[PDB]
Amino acid sequence: PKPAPRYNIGLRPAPKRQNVGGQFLATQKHYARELWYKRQYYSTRPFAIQKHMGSTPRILLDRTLWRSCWLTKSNLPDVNRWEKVVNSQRVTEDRWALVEEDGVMYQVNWK
Amino acid sequence: RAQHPNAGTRFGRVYNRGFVRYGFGGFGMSVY
């Protein structure tokens, strides 16, 4: 009858043991930041490297974390080739770095 | 200590220039 404490579940990553909050609120553990990349307070968002919290990732790119650190060996195998999903496929395109030549920017190859 | 709101200046006490002179009574705070 009495509906559950969604608190913050399924949206956002767990809060960190505020003064307030019921007994049924499952905060995060001692000595574990709620925002993985905020090792400092000014460590900036990693560009294209997300950590998949929650369930088994549907489509795990090679450049996202899954219970693991970042390994320049295993995460981005070739730095010149650069992946994405297309039609639910893990395809890999040549990385392009944008340069402007005529007022417009050009998706020129990166290597 | 009787910590009740309305027992003194609400949160602590501050001495802004409109107080250090023209205190309660207008004749000024003892110090400052």
Partner: protein, 92 residues
């Protein structure tokens, strides 16, 4: 490795579910005998009996030796004190 890196590898006592209390604990018996709570919903007097009704009778006033016989309410300042231990059952 993270919580203490050596306090969590060597193992101490692990805590488990904590047993609850008698969840009609706060209807203690010094009310289950002294008072009785009467009243319709949203007005419950905890009527009690007279204060001086057993100790000294000879010589007390004639018409005050009986004010000890009525089921008087206890003044609400105590109604809320005693009935406070009963509200706690599911707060919020």
């Amino acid at each position: 490795p993270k919580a203490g890196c050596e306090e969590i590898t060597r193992q101490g006592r692990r805590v488990v579910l904590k047993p609850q209390e008698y969840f009609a604990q706060h209807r203690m018996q010094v009310w289950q005998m002294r008072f009785k709570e009467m009243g319709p919903p949203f007005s419950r007097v905890w009527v009690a009996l007279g204060g001086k009704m057993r100790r000294r009778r000879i010589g007390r006033q004639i018409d005050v030796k009986d004010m000890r016989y009525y089921w008087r309410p206890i003044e609400p300042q105590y109604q809320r004190l005693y009935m406070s231990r009963l509200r706690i059952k599911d707060h919020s």
